[PDB]
Amino acid sequence: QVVVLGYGTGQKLSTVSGSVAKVSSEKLAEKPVANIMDALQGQVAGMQVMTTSGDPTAVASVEIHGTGSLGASSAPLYIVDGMQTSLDVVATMNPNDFESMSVLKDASATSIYGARAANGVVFIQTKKGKMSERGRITFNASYGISQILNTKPLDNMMTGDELLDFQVKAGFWGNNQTVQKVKDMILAGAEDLYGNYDSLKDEYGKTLFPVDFNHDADWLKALFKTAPTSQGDISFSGGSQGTSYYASIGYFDQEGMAREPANFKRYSGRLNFESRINEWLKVGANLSGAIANRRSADYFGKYYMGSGTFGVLTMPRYYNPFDVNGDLADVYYMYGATRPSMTEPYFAKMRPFSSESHQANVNGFAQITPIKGLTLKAQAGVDITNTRTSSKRMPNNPYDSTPLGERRERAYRDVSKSFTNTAEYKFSIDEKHDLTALMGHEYIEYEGDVIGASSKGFESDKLMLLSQGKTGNSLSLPEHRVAEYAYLSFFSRFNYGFDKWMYIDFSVRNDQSSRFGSNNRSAWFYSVGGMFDIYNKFIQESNWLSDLRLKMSYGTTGNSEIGNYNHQALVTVNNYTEDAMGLSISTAGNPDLSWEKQSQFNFGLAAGAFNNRLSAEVDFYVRTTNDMLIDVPMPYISGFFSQYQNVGSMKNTGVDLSLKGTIYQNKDWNVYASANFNYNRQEITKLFFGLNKYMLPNTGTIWEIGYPNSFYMAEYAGIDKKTGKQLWYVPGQVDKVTTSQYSADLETRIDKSVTPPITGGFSLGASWKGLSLDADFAYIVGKWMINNDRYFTENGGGLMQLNKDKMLLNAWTEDNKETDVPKLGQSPQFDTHLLENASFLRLKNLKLTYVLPNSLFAGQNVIGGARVYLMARNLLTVTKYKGFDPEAGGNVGKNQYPNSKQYVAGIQLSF
């Protein structure tokens, strides 16, 4: 293999000293989701990736070698064959055009993207097309369905006939009330609400029943559905003497599983072209475009009565949103409601939304080779995005506050551009010495803006332009936001190699930026690394060992994902009189704003046995972060409340390993397996002005010196069998003593960390005669999560109108005194009994494919092959969590969008 790490031509993979991990094109393609990073959960060792939502428009979160900062971001640098991108822009690119994906994660691989590569770098390379006599056409098509992972938290909930009894015994309906007196008249009087409205005045009791007690309703079918997914592509790959092209046109439509709409749809195209003009010049261009229409489910992560998974858990089962035909109606009924509550397709019909994004990427390079070794490369690139969204609210619907309608239009524009000029020279001094020298220049620039205009007061559905609203008081100020930055850089790298066995590389880079404060704007980074081939020199041959390499490196990088404007003292409006405005300083800045400098030491070795049958690689890293960013609280001589400076230090120590192997049974059978693992423990070295502990306000965590940032809550000791109250532990006062009163002095540091330490995954595959079967598993163990829905589904007092758990029927009382749940007259707090073990093991995809044999296409000169495949994503998940998904969240599991399991089936004609 040949890897292009950074800049210049590729070296080798058994020569690089920096522990890169190359992912081939088999693991990226054929995937049925929009994000490409989610297909890498468990492949690259030491990189954990978690998608915290099951939207089509969701984006995975990637973290390589831990979380390196408490205060800034942790996402890597994603660059796509040159100029860098965001994940929302790689989501508008067809994943069948990616040839490889190399993950650079240790210094002397990452340290020439200095001030941007403190969190690693993912380097996605696109296809280039093979030079042959006649080109090749490839036509892919897929179709699948998507649905919710597991319906386990519905096995615990009450029914209707149990919830009525628990509510009337708890005293919610009345002091002396009873069932058949509460059931019959006080809340089956929903004909007093259904009688005012003309659309359902004559239909109550004939074709829709809002309150039904004889059998419960299915709220999962009322709030979640089974959603299709389609995908197709045509790609032409060709070449000739010198000239080589790869074109592609594709389409991808994916619909969300919840009833509240969320779709992602794109039409894309790509033309990679590369041709050499004469003996000393070669030009090329990567061009891409997309027209993408997103929509996302917004009411997830918030608590609203009757939406999300909170509405599946808590909405009482004796309310009925369906009609008598099993279809969803326009409205349902809650008690004490002034207006009937709209269901999800009616609310999706009354609140339209439409986004359209036009994306263009233009990338061009010209390469000149005058002398035998010199190579001068100049590369330019532009990245243009114009988005235009519109959302209205329709007039004259009866189940609303006002009959008038609103409209809002927004226009977005993000323009990025990048220039890179390198000069490489490689030469051999003797018969056994070798050198390579690279030096270059880079310039990055981004500017983007948002414009928005809103109007309200419409009375017709046809007369809904934005200049037809109501004047006077029904009109407001526009929206307008502008951001921009720029980077300049000069880098250099020397690769000195001995004959076969010793390679040493040394790199340096200078970065200046618009984000760094005006006193230190120039940043210097370096790295040194070395690899020694012990097999080619020391032990020349053996019977069981076939390869053995050792490598070590040290480097410094930085993280300039600080804000665009965080180093300067912003003045705002502070008026004195009524006629003239005044300006007064409001943030104080600081001119000495650094780039959050970190340094990494890495040591590893890679072995290979039984003539490259078995392969192993072990890596030990110490990654020390310095000068992190915190908005500190300031002394009073500042005259401000914060300064937002560079204080603190952290370190992550870890070990990761990776094994690959091949097993056989015959000359046609072929079995293989892989397994990788990463352990990472972190600690906080220092902090602010001589502090030891510091808790960030209303977050739930604490930064203690000497420990990872853990959870900061109360302990829970259960109930007592005397009076049946909740008992929390006391920090200290060992005898341990419990108090029944809750105060904010009962909080301590829990011994459970926030980011999960142990991350891994293992794959196993087989192949018989062109019919293969592969299975990939991914596990994260050591991850705790606050389950927030259990605040509402099992509280004794307060929020009594909602559906509860079944374990409130065994409540503590005088005749029932041996249980584990408290009395009914209490309110639970946020404490240790809401932390749950969110460790999981998933089966990421099971894929069974079949390539039709070459003897079937013998006379036909048109079609040259075919492939059929079946695929199941998220087929099994084993865990101990109780909230529909252990992966969907982090530090808090709210009303969440679960990850979805999917079944797809596809063909591919290589005709």
């Binding site: 609203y304 739930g700 929020l799 946020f830 709210k894």
Partner: peptide, 12 residues
Amino acid sequence: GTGGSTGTTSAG
């Protein structure tokens, strides 16, 4: 859907 924000939730 909407109607009542039914919240005593923790910060994300």
